[PDB]
């Protein structure tokens, strides 16, 4: 139906592929499109990054560019937007004034983890009044069989299970990251997760949306198209509904 979206960056050729890959909707990490021109029928989806990105003049654009707002990229991980639960409560009045649509930040693991980032944000959250519309994940599988897409499956489940919202998808790939360098699954392994991931994504009727990490190989080596040209993955992403 409408599930399936992309993170994207203007590369040269972004409107052709994202209007070749089939993406529904579309987000960026930022609070507009960052140069992209979307095709007909692709929804921009704003986000605010980080504490840094709470300004009126961010919060203006974002609602100006779209009617969903993501929240914080991975607060939970000092390399990413690195704040505490007690911050992104504190900032939230001014997302959730906007009155958009609005996901939880997104962390980077863990948000079935009873006292871990997630749960203390949904909890002080619920104990402030907030609100809190979807829950969008981020996971990156480290077994690259068969067996991936019922671990995603089952990551997904325990999330909605805990905190009954809607969930989105907004970064998923396989990769690896527990070594010295990343580890990425071969061509053909990860077209046929692809294929698997998005069939289990489009019937869990839980899941609103979805997006592959990333459109582009200049993004990521997990990239579903270099230029304008889809690799094998990118061919399986566009058969996806
Ligand atoms: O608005 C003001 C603000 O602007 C910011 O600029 C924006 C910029 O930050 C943004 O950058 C994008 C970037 O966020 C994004 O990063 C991804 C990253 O999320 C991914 O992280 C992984 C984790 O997901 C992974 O988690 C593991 C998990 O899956 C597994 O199940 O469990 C593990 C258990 O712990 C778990 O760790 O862990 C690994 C290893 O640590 C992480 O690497 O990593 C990918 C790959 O490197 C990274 O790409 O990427 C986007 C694509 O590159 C970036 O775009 O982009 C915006 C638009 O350009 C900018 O606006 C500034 O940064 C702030 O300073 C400003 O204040």
């Known amino acids: 139906g409408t ?28 609070a507009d499109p960052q140069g992209i021109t979307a095709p007909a029928g692709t929804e921009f989806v704003p986000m605010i ?32 937007a690195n704040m505490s639960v007690e911050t992104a409560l504190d900032l939230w ?13 997104a962390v980077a693991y863990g948000g079935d983890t009873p006292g871990g980032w997630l749960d203390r944000f949904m ?6 009044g907030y609100r809190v519309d979807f829950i969008p ?29 809607p969930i989105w998808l907004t970064q998923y790939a396989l990769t690896d990251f527990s070594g010295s360098t990343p580890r990425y699954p071969s061509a053909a392994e990860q077209a046929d997760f692809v294929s698997r991931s ?3 994504l489009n019937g869990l009727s839980f899941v609103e949306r979805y997006a592959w990490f990333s459109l582009s190989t200049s993004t990521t080596p997990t990239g579903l198209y270099t230029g304008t040209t889809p690799n094998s993955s990118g061919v399986a992403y566009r058969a996806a509904g």
Do not use: C, I
């Open 3 to 30: 599930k399936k979206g992309v993170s994207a960056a203007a590369f040269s050729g972004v409107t052709a592929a994202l209007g070749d890959v089939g993406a529904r909707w579309f987000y960026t990490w930022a």
């Open 49 to 80: 990054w980080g504490r840094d990105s709470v300004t009126a003049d961010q919060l203006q654009r974002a609602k100006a560019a779209g009617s969903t707002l993501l929240a914080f990229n991975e607060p939970d991980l000092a390399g990413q």
């Open 93 to 105: 009045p001014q997302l959730q004034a906007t009155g958009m649509r609005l996901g939880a930040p």
């Open 123 to 128: 909890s002080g959250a619920a104990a402030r």
């Open 137 to 165: 994940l981020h996971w990156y599988g480290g077994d690259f069989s068969a067996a991936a897409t019922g671990q995603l499956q089952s990551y997904l489940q325990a999330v909605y299970n805990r905190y009954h919202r």
């Open 198 to 200: 998005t069939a289990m």
